[PDB]
From a paper:
A potential workaround to the size limitation in cryo-EM is to bind a small protein of interest (the “cargo”) to a much larger carrier (the “scaffold”) in order to make it large enough to visualize readily. In the present study, we demonstrate a protein design advance that substantially rigidifies a cryo-EM scaffold based on fusion of a DARPin as the modular binding domain to a designed protein cage. Analogous to antibodies, sequence variations in the nonconserved loop regions of a DARPin protein can be selected in the laboratory in order to obtain a variant that binds nearly any protein of interest. The rigidified scaffold described here provides a number of advantageous properties for cryo-EM structure determination—size, symmetry, and modular binding—making it suitable for future applications to many important systems.
KRAS is a 19-kDa GTPase involved in signal transduction in cell proliferation pathways. KRAS is among the most prevalent human oncogenes, with mutations in KRAS occurring in about 25% of all cancers. Some of the most clinically relevant mutations occur at amino acid residues Gly12 and Gly13. For imaging experiments, we investigated three different sequence variants of KRAS—single site mutants G12V, G12C, and G13C—in their GDP-bound forms. All three KRAS variants were found to bind with good occupancy to our cryo-EM scaffold (presenting the KRAS-specific DARPin). Following similar protocols as for the G13C mutant, for the G12V mutant, we obtained a final map reconstruction with a resolution of 2.4 Å for the entire particle and 3.1 Å around the KRAS protein. The maps and refined KRAS structures were all closely comparable, with significant differences in the maps occurring only at the mutated amino acid side chains, as anticipated. As an assessment of coordinate precision, the rms deviation between the two most closely related cryo-EM structures (the G12V and G12C mutants) was 0.58 Å; this is slightly less than the differences when compared to previously reported X-ray crystal structure, which are between 0.73 and 1.1 Å.
Numbering used by the authors:
A (entry chain B): 1 to 165
B (entry chain A): 163 to 320
Write the structure that this text describes.
């Protein structure tokens, strides 16, 4: 059929590993090693057609890697996750975007902005600011919570629907 | 009390504190203690690159073929990182070379995809089935073609 290479990027501790395990194993991992980078494969059906997803959960960004570099170049979709209770993570989203822009060497790249930890009520980043950044970039914005499975499936499905368009 | 002691052992192995691990090991800490996913102290010591902690844990009785929630053994983590000293020590104590995770991937598959050629040569020496297919139907040779690894292709073909 068709295979998709989806890359999950963001700051450390934002919930990238919990997001990917929730999609695949339908389970919330309370604690995961912050340095393990691995690629997983899933078979899901989107709006009636089955497909294969090749998802990379990036980690350890301070050291050069060969698999990550190849994944970034050939990546078809990019999840830009950030935590809503950490302002520094949100500011880092621009840093990742410009690096992906120069790596891919393009102005229009299938991208979906993700805000994790929706269940924590100590919110520091408001929806208006996140939506304003998404509208300026032109990419859809979604709210997710790996603890309560809130919008986990809609995040990945929307990204695939963005690649098709 | 017993569970709190185990959580200290896992952190000491990950941090790489030789004195801390030995003290907790004689205190009654369990070598087979694991966190939520299933990482044992052998999983974390092999991952981060500590040799003496792996040797000490193995002699105490840590299970060499334990797997986490995704079915990955300590040989998997050491192969994906490029730890040539650790993998040979793990093979010397009788570890499974043809183990598979929930995606049916062999430590050869992981090392070949990341690009560690010296790790691949050791696994091929100790009898790693090159003609192994995962649950999605790929071989280590297919990885070399897809990733354009001519050096890996030469090793795989030979
Ligand atoms: N409350 C809450 N905590 C989360 C959520 N996602 C992740 N976490 C916590 O964030 C911590 C670190 O996340 P982690 O999986 O390491 O993200 P990573 O560093 O990008 O791999 C974990 O201990 C989780 O308990 C969420 O949706 N809600
Ligand atoms: Mg992670």
């Amino acid at each position: 059929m068709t295979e998709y290479k989806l890359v999950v990027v963001g700051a450390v501790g934002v919930g990238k590993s919990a997001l990917t395990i929730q999609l695949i194993q339908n389970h919330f991992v309370d604690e995961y090693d912050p340095t393990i980078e691995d690629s997983y494969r899933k078979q899901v059906v989107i709006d009636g057609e089955t497909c294969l997803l090749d998802i990379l959960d990036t980690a350890g960004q301070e050291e050069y890697s060969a698999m990550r570099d190849q994944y970034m170049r050939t990546g078809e979709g990019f999840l830009c996750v950030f935590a809503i209770n950490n302002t520094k993570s949100f500011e880092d989203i621009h840093h990742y975007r410009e690096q992906i822009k120069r790596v891919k060497d393009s102005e229009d790249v299938p991208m979906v902005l993700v805000g994790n930890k929706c269940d924590l009520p100590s919110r520091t980043v408001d929806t208006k600011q996140a939506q304003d950044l998404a509208r300026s970039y032109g990419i859809p914005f979604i709210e997710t919570s790996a603890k309560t499975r809130q919008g986990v499936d809609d995040a990945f499905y929307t990204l695939v629907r963005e690649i098709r368009k | 009390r017993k569970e709190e002691l185990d959580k200290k052992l896992l952190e000491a192995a990950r941090a790489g504190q030789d004195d801390e691990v030995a003290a907790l090991l004689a205190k009654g800490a369990d070598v087979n203690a694991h966190d939520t996913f299933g990482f044992t102290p052998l999983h974390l010591a092999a991952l981060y690159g500590h040799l003496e902690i792996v040797e000490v844990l193995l002699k105490r009785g840590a299970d060499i073929n334990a797997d986490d929630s995704y079915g990955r053994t300590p040989l998997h983590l050491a192969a994906m990182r490029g730890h040539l000293e650790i993998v040979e020590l793990l093979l010397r104590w009788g570890a499974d070379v043809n183990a598979a995770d929930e995606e049916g991937r062999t430590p050869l598959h992981l090392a070949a995809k990341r690009g560690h050629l010296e790790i691949v040569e050791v696994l091929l020496k100790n009898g790693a089935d090159v003609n192994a297919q995962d649950k999605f139907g790929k071989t280590a040779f297919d990885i070399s073609i897809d990733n354009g690894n001519e050096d890996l292709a030469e090793i795989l073909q030979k």
